């Protein structure tokens, strides 16, 4: 569905994974989180709203922080994703992140991803993405970007915790902020706040998507 979407840009996919090579011809891949489902773009369901003021203290609020960005707008570009992460894992290892975006227009875009601990930035990754023309529109893809060391270590530390409630306790103060901007106009195309809990489902990782509103 065209859910995490402003008028200029739609995020179709987000996934973080662990890939293990048994032998040169055999690979096992485990997904921590994902967005993506089999429904067409126009399926776009009604999304519940979250008063953005309720989440400000989990992100940096300096010049160029979440409040600043939201007030500058467009406010219809702002979303909150809550993930229930699948941490049930078991050869050489690769930790990766993959994402996909679509637009009707050909832009050069910048994706900024900031990991936050107690509302303070601990690590940032910046990527510039160019379009491929595809099926009547423009596609932007990040394919198997290497997960940074801080996050690999964070996942290791969480897994060594004896109890699932303890993992959830650590996650109360862990957030990620993603800003996607048109490099030429400096327009905010998408802004996605992420928060995490440990999944207890047997049908894999789960999510809920919310619009962020001024209230």
């Amino acid at each position: 569905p065209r859910s995490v979407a402003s008028s200029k840009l739609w995020m179709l996919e987000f996934s973080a994974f662990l890939e293990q090579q048994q032998d040169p011809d055999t690979y096992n891949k485990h997904l921590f989180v994902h967005i993506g489902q089999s429904s067409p773009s126009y399926s776009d369901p009604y999304l519940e709203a979250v008063d953005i003021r309720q989440i400000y203290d989990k992100f940096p609020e300096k010049k160029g922080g979440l409040k600043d960005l939201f007030e500058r707008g467009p406010s219809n570009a702002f979303f909150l994703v809550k993930f229930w992460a699948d941490l049930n894992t078991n050869g050489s290892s690769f930790y990766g992140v993959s994402s996909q975006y679509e637009s009707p227009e050909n832009m050069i875009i910048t994706c900024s991803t900031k990991v936050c601990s107690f509302g303070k930035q601990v690590v940032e990754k910046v990527e510039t993405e160019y379009a491929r023309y595809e099926n009547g529109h423009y596609s932007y893809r990040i394919h198997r970007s290497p997960l940074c060391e801080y996050m690999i270590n964070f996942i290791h530390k969480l897994k060594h915790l004896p109890e699932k409630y303890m993992m959830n306790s650590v996650l109360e103060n862990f957030t990620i902020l993603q800003v996607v901007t048109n490099r030429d106009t400096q327009e905010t195309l998408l802004c996605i706040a992420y928060v995490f809990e440990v999944s207890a489902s047997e049908h894999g990782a789960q999510h809920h998507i919310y619009r962020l509103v001024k209230e």
Binding site: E48, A49, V50, D51, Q54, I55, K82, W84, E172, V195, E197, S199, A200, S201, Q206, H207, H208, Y210
Partner: peptide
């Protein structure tokens, strides 16, 4: 705590 914040009921119900 997140549990005392004004948020929809779904935020605490894993689909």
């Amino acid at each position: 705590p997140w549990r005392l914040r004004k948020x929809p009921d779904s935020f605490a119900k894993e689909p």
